[PDB]
Paper text:
When present in high concentrations, such as in pathological inflammatory states, extracellular ATP acts as a danger signal to cells by binding to and activating the P2X7 receptor (P2X7R). This spatiotemporal signaling stimulates the innate immune system by triggering assembly of the NLRP3 inflammasome and subsequent cytokine release, as well as activation of various less understood signaling cascades, ultimately resulting in apoptosis. P2X7R antagonists bind to either classical or extended allosteric ligand-binding sites that exist within the extracellular domain at the interface of two protomers.
To characterize the molecular differences between key mammalian P2X7R orthologs, we obtained cryo-EM structures of the full-length wild-type mP2X7 (2.5 Å) and hP2X7 (2.5 Å) receptors in the apo closed state conformation. However, we also identified ortholog-specific features in the hP2X7R, including two cholesterol hemisuccinate (CHS) binding sites per protomer at the interface between transmembrane helix 1 (TM1) and transmembrane helix 2 (TM2) on what would be the extracellular leaflet of the membrane bilayer. The two CHS molecules are stacked on top of each other such that the inner molecule is closer to the TM1/TM2 interface, and the outer molecule is positioned between TM1 and the inner molecule. The inner CHS molecule is coordinated by hydrophobic interactions with residues F328 and L333 on TM2; F38, V41, C42, L45, and Y51 on TM1; and W265 on the lower body domain. The outer CHS molecule is coordinated by hydrophobic interactions with residues F38, C42, and V46 on TM1; residue F266 on the lower body domain; and the inner CHS molecule. Interestingly, although not apparent from sequence alignments, our structure of the hP2X7R shows that the larger side chain of V312 forces the adjacent, conserved residue Y295 to adopt an alternative rotameric conformation compared to its conformation in both mP2X7R and rP2X7R, condensing the size of the pocket in hP2X7R. Thus, the classical allosteric ligand-binding site in the human ortholog has a different size and shape, which impacts the binding of allosteric antagonists. As a result of these residue differences, the classical allosteric pocket of the hP2X7R is smaller than in the rP2X7R or the mP2X7R in the apo closed state conformation. CHS-binding sites were only evident in the apo closed state structure of the hP2X7R. The CHS-binding sites are located on the extracellular leaflet of the membrane, similar to the location of CHS in the apo closed state structure of the hP2X1R and likely represent cholesterol binding sites in vivo.
Author numbering:
A (entry chain C), B (entry chain A), C (entry chain B): 6 to 75, 83 to 435, 473 to 595
The structure:
């Protein structure tokens, strides 16, 4: 109903005045809160992070004097050593080999072990070797004098097999400068900045400590940073990485979006010719001379500079913070988990029978028995088979959640439970019990005696006659609930019989949890039925409430 | 104060010995833990993942014999069929159309339906058609014999409208090989590796099962993988993707960082000429012949290979694991939520009056009544309007949280509550009540009788005279709290009057929660006031504690 | 054991029938659930998001009539104004400066302030100025007539220092069109789509409202969108961004994967010549004329269009949803936290002694005293030093968890605690106490009197003689636990002495929590020992249970 909707259940708690557990709780809480705040700040988990969208524009500056045997000196400019390719990459030629006046004809292949032939049997027509730039014609030919090489259809004259020039022809390229303009955007955050800000000094060169924001880089300085030697790499070439990292906080109070520049060689420093070490490409200049298409083939060596731009932009997001806080909230209940585990363990008797005698430092932790007693109440499943049995000659109570397979309940011994400390037949050991008058199937239930060993019956006790058999007590108990009650003698006697069973069960078992499922001894049962007999019929006996 | 800071509140709990609920709890816990661990391992939620920073370097190898009508055979090398463009992409020419000796002049446009004119009226001076590479001059001209085309300023001779050659001139390009060198970095994790490791066989070609780590790829094999036909795509061209995936675990014990190679065609397999199918571009060779700038225009068809490199690098992060664990901790309380929901539902009487008679399989779930009784205590808001009423002729108690609008409290019937089973006037049905002597506004409160229907007054009960009106009982109760108390007769009588109200309320209502807000019947009230009258003045009556 | 494994502990709770707290709980729950669902939907936190892998293919269409003084008109096509560079970028030449017939020789440098020399002293041999494309030879030379410039080895004739042409020679480039084909993939989700779908109109041009899905873009329209003027940027050049955003939901029921096109200028709108404003590059055409390698140097101005493709693809992931729900579950316990905080504060007496008299609106919140009483039970650490003391002349009880440094326990006054309202020597103020017969070290414990101020001893009370000293009461209490008990007179007397201590402690302190650690007054102690003396020996006294 409506009145049941507007309810609030609060947990019943026990507040413990303990230095140890209070200190533990607050230590746990402070550590957890400090780590939670530290993780939040360090990893900026309150921030939504957006990857950087980058655009790079490079401007390489520098001229080189190049000396080639012919000896002639020439000046190379950007139009000569730079091949406009990309923005996130630029290439600087550092060396070259020139093959001039090539033509599509038949020519003697350059002398090599795979090529040098003695007769036409050492060459197959149409053979396309992976190591040739030509297709075999089948016949050997004189490359020069004694040398006999396999003729091949290709661009001719064939390239000479020669290593790259040493020293590199554009070794002066380490003195070249590149200006890098990097525009970045965070479209989700709608933020864009660039690496060159107004007022930045433009006549500087980058230095990681002196000028770490000058976007002008000397290539030799890049190689020094990486520990690589420009002169060596210039010969055969390579690939260098210019990393631009953007750790950008777009919170206006803590705003910072500047690049960090780092350098990384990207080509393997290998000498395995099978792997094509360095960085080179064959680039052909075409020109029409003598009404024929010609080719100046240049094997271009150089260094490709890859501009690697990466990073994130963070701005405060409520949802991210909420998610993080919710992911951290359950950690504050671990103090309770730990302390409750301590209360549950140290309440165990084992911790005192064996441990404390050995480790006498832990004895003061016996207070957890009191804490557990005040904290936890143990209850059993109220099953129809549940029965509780008390013997006056025993200090404990037996729980029998076990079917009686025709066995006397006196002989069925179940697990012991402690009594709440509020403060003729063969199975009879008191000589005051009578056989059960129930159906034989259910007769074993009442085959129980007040005592496990021979002795005096509990019926002979004073308190049995004052508590259980006193008409005044039972009448008072009945009137307390029904003050004006008036019943026939038989109905009243039945009520007093029930109240007497109740009184015995409460007296010997205590809690109604046990007294509800208690079983009266035959002696007490039949004494009560003698004090309050029914006019007619037979007694139903124990009927479990569930 | 300080002593209040060092406190620990533990929750009071009820431990249930139940097979069903213990099994349910442990089943829930095991399932939740297993799923939590499985999710953690599978998605590596203990790891901080960094996107890969990639650098690609390609080396295409292969020569092609090209036959063009003129019939002449020529050998194409990389310098011829490759246009150095990028690292994450390479292009292989597969076909071409050559237009030689172009000049900037006035020329007859190539015959087309849009172009063919009969007179100068079919061409507008300065017209720039989207389908022309020229600007109209206004006059028709003879392309050849009868053909009359619109003269146009453009590069001349104009290109012939011809499809790409079939078969492709560089069909042998499927036999070409590309070596891909991929360098990757995880700057946050400070890890870099490359796809070619020392010892990798260099004379292999990639195969997805035999050699899935050879970075040398035959282009035809790529197309076979994709199910595309190289011969067909070579004619008009296309775009192929070489995907390099890096699933890299940088935990040293479980370290693995190798690439997975896959292939994906990236151009639409369309035949819509409006959409410019394939991949072609017009590239012009410039040469000075006859002291004039000329142009050999080549329509270059071929396949662009895009190298797509993606992936993540994971290394264990404490913060990520902490966040995940905290996000999973609350799921362990769902067993408690579920079982408490079961206890709350199955405690409902509805589950037994109607359900169990129908579904007799659920009857053993009646134990939840006991569990709920041992688990939950219901309390009401102690409002000034709160009043509890008990009639001896009823087995229940009425709660009246409702203002008395001049109505007798006997006539005001509130909702019924069950009594805690601890074990002359017109509105009078017992003939022992007197009218209220309070102000008329507050007189209706005491207009209550001990019984709802005619009968004997509860004052005639024995227990009323023994519990409520016995001087010994009240004196004992007062001395129990104040052993040495001694008061004037009037003060003592007032104390006994209060204690008698208390005794009636406790006897008929039980818990002080109800007895505090109980209302004594007029009969009992005035009998008590007769047994313990005050010397002078009038009786204040009921004063709610709140 | 096994029976202890199959247990379920449920929390004991108090259900409060309160409009205020029920409404607060449900308001909290509804707000939290609504925000949780809103965050989930808005941020799609049930989805695993994959970054887009993009491939771009551009096709620029348009021809321009170019007029250069010589005055001659020429038609430029793609082969002329487009430099095949990349897919994610395309370049359109908009202006150029041509330097024809350059040769590698010695030439007079172009007149500038840094260059103009009067004699050979104004030029250093081999000097490589950053602003020169040549290397100084050391001698001045006549550029023209009076002008004297420093001779320099370079490509000659040296380029004239001239601004870019105004108006731009390819100003008609704003009428050019580019078709952008964008293929995207989500490899984890195994989804690929493209921006051109079947049925898309191909004769349109993009408009942000009319045709926001036409992938054909007029460049001038892009600049209008950005608010930039194409004519101005065409002169010196620039960089424009075409952003393609993919917000793609790959859930089939809510599936949508289409691009959003936006435009952003990427070059800084700077006029600082040091920063190389615009976008230009020097591109050289090489031709062999007169058996010499020549160079037509073109300074190419134009606009680079960067195609920026970004976005995510989301598909439902169970793990992500589970993580989010778990991160949100603990927020539902904040209603309980808040209401329990309210119960804990408003139970404070301070809220009534001072606050309510001032703020009389809060008085009805005094019910939290009742709620806290029904919710929280406070217990103390049962330390060996813990002792409770009650004086009959005081209404409260004193807790002494403090060692007695030879001080009489009567003089040691500890903190006050309220009694559970169940309902000759110098330190003696009643004249019935005797000195302690314990060892002097432990004698101060029993140096306690029944009353703090002079008066009658509690032993003179009737209830002391009826409850504590009545043999019947104690015998009944002993038989209630041991009905058939029979002991020697000395053992029985010891049992009655213990039970009398128990009865006094229970009567004056109540709960066994206090009565366990209570200290009997010397008067009561010795009266009890007189009523039940031991045959021989001395009395041990108080022994703390812990
Ligand atoms: C870790 C747990 C235990 C405690 C939770 C701490 C939070 C209260 C902190 C974490 C991140 C903090 C935020 C970090 C960044 C910002 C941005 C800041 O705004 C700006 O800096 C920009 C101002 C502008 O928008 O113009 C305002 C404070 C705020 C929201 C902070 C408010 C306090 C927050 C939410
Ligand atoms: C899912 C819930 C219920 C249980 C939590 C399980 C954790 C205890 C697991 C999850 C991930 C595990 C980690 C996975 C990876 C590593 C890296 C491993 O280190 C290495 O492999 C590299 C060693 C090196 O650093 O040189 C050390 C163990 C550790 C921290 C593991 C420790 C155990 C962890 C934290
Ligand atoms: C926010 C808290 C308090 C409540 C949790 C809500 C969930 C039950 C919602 C959140 C996201 C929802 C999902 C969003 C998307 C989908 C995909 C949908 O499948 C499709 O659309 C594609 C069908 C196909 O696979 O072919 C099926 C429903 C499902 C799983 C939804 C089921 C209901 C979900 C898990
Ligand atoms: C950097 O590289 C250059 C070129 O490889 C090294 O100089 C060469 O060193 C070898 C061995 O001594 C000589 O035979 C060559 O004649 C040198 N060439 C030049 C250009 O002088 C140079 O030594 C390397 N750097 C360092 C520091 O060792
Ligand atoms: C790719 O290379 C293979 C191997 O050279 C070619 O197949 C050969 O083709 C010739 C001419 O038809 C035959 O004489 C050979 O017997 C073939 N060899 C094998 C092993 O089959 C193939 O034609 C080439 N493909 C293209 C498109 O050029
Ligand atoms: C792969 O593509 C080639 C070229 O389109 C196909 O070969 C052509 O097929 C048509 C139809 O039979 C013939 O008219 C042409 O003469 C063929 N050209 C060549 C080069 O032979 C080839 O059939 C396609 N692959 C497959 C398996 O069908
Ligand atoms: C867009 O740019 C063009 C070129 O800069 C501007 O046209 C020039 O404007 C100046 C100043 O009035 C004149 O001296 C030039 O002769 C103009 N050039 C041309 C090509 O006409 C134009 O004004 C700019 N757009 C707007 C709207 O101001
Ligand atoms: N706990 C308990 N209850 C009993 C016992 N014997 C009888 N009762 C209760 O007494 C009632 C039956 O009374 P009884 O004299 O046995 O049968 P009756 O004469 O037919 O009413 C039922 O409510 C039983 O639960 C017993 O040994 N233990
Ligand atoms: N629960 C309850 N308390 C009552 C009732 N009548 C009086 N009291 C209490 O008795 C005290 C007043 O005593 P009373 O004889 O009514 O008035 P007095 O003579 O002025 O003291 C107050 O503490 C009341 O709360 C009643 O019907 N029910
Ligand atoms: N709470 C409490 N227990 C007491 C006090 N005096 C004695 N006892 C208990 O009584 C028992 C000792 O009885 P006592 O006559 O003092 O000594 P005994 O004659 O050697 O047995 C122990 O269990 C004590 O805890 C007292 O003042 N307070
Ligand atoms: C007598 O019964 C003493 C036995 C104590 C058993 C508890 C042992 C404590 C060690 C931890 C056991 C639980 C695992 C917790 C892992 C963090
Ligand atoms: C007896 O009850 C002693 C129990 C004490 C439990 C503490 C066990 C060590 C764990 C300490 C962890 C927190 C650091 C110390 C807090 C002061
Ligand atoms: C008599 O009162 C029996 C009525 C039982 C009502 C409970 C019905 C159980 C079905 C679930 C209802 C709550 C929704 C839970 C969704 C997971
Ligand atoms: C009466 O109290 C029976 C209640 C039993 C509750 C179980 C209802 C079915 C839900 C089971 C979910 C867990 C799987 C089975 C555990 C053994
Ligand atoms: C008398 O004792 C009244 C004092 C009340 C103290 C409580 C003050 C309430 C304000 C909040 C204090 C706790 C911080 C909560 C932050 C959200
Ligand atoms: C006395 O016990 C009054 C306590 C009332 C607590 C409410 C204090 C204000 C916080 C309200 C937050 C939720 C919105 C209002 C719910 C109806
Ligand atoms: Na949580
Ligand atoms: Zn017997
Ligand atoms: Zn017996
Ligand atoms: Zn009446
Ligand atoms: Zn009456
Ligand atoms: Zn004294
Ligand atoms: Zn005294």
């Amino acid at each position: 109903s409506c009145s049941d909707v507007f309810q609030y259940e609060t947990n019943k708690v026990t507040r413990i005045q303990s230095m140890n557990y209070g200190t533990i709780k607050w230590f746990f809480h402070v550590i957890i809160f400090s780590y939670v705040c530290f993780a939040l700040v360090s990893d900026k988990l309150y921030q939504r992070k957006e990857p950087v969208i980058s655009s790079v524009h490079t401007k390489v500056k520098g001229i080189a004097e190049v000396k080639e045997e012919i000896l002639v000196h020439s000046v190379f400019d950007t139009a000569d050593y730079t091949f406009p390719l990309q923005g996130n990459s630029f290439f600087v030629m550092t060396n070259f080999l020139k093959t001039e006046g090539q033509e599509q004809r038949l020519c003697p292949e350059y002398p090599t072990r795979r090529t040098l032939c003695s007769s036409d049997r050492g060459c197959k027509k149409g053979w396309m070797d992976p190591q040739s730039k030509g297709i075999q014609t089948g016949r050997c030919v004189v490359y020069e004098g004694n040398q006999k090489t396999c003729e091949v259809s290709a661009w001719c004259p064939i390239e000479a097999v020669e290593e790259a020039p040493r020293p590199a022809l554009l070794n002066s390229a380490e003195n070249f400068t590149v200006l890098i303009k990097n525009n970045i955007d965070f479209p989700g955050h709608n933020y864009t900045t660039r690496n060159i800000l107004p007022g930045l000094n433009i006549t500087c060169t980058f230095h990681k400590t002196q000028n770490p924001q000058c976007p002008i880089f000397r290539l030799g300085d890049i190689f020094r940073e990486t520990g690589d030697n420009f002169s060596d790499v210039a010969i055969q070439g390579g690939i260098m990485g210019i990393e631009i990292y953007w750790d950008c906080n777009l919170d206006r109070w803590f705003h910072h979006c500047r690049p960090k520049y780092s350098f990384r060689r990207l080509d393997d420093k290998t000498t395995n010719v099978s792997l094509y070490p360095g960085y080179n490409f064959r680039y052909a200049k075409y020109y029409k001379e003598n009404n024929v298409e010609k080719r100046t083939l240049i094997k271009v060596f150089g260094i490709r500079f890859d501009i690697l731009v990466f990073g994130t932009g963070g701005k405060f997001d409520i949802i991210q913070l909420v998610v993080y806080i919710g992911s951290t909230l359950s950690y504050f209940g671990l103090a309770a988990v730990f302390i409750d585990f301590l209360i549950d363990t140290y309440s165990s008797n084992c911790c005192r029978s064996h441990i404390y005698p050995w480790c006498k430092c832990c004895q003061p932790c016996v207070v957890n028995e009191y804490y557990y007693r005040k904290k936890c109440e143990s209850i059993v499943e109220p099953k129809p088979t549940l029965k509780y049995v008390s013997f006056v000659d025993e200090s404990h109570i037996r729980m029998v959640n076990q079917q009686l397979l025709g066995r006397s309940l006196q002989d069925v011994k179940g697990q012991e439970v402690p009594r709440p400390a509020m403060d003729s037949p063969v199975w009879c050991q008191c000589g005051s019990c009578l056989p059960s008058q129930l159906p034989e199937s259910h007769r074993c239930l009442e085959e129980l005696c007040c005592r496990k060993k021979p002795g005096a019956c509990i019926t002979t006790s004073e308190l049995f006659r004052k508590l259980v058999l006193s008409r005044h007590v039972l009448q008072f108990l009945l009137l307390y609930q029904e003050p004006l009650l008036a019943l026939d003698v038989d109905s009243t006697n039945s009520r007093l019989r029930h109240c007497a069973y109740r009184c015995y069960a409460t007296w010997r078992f205590g809690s109604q949890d046990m007294a509800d499922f208690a079983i009266l001894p035959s002696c007490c049962r039949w004494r009560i039925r003698k004090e309050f007999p029914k006019s007619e019929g037979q007694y139903s006996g124990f009927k479990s409430p569930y």
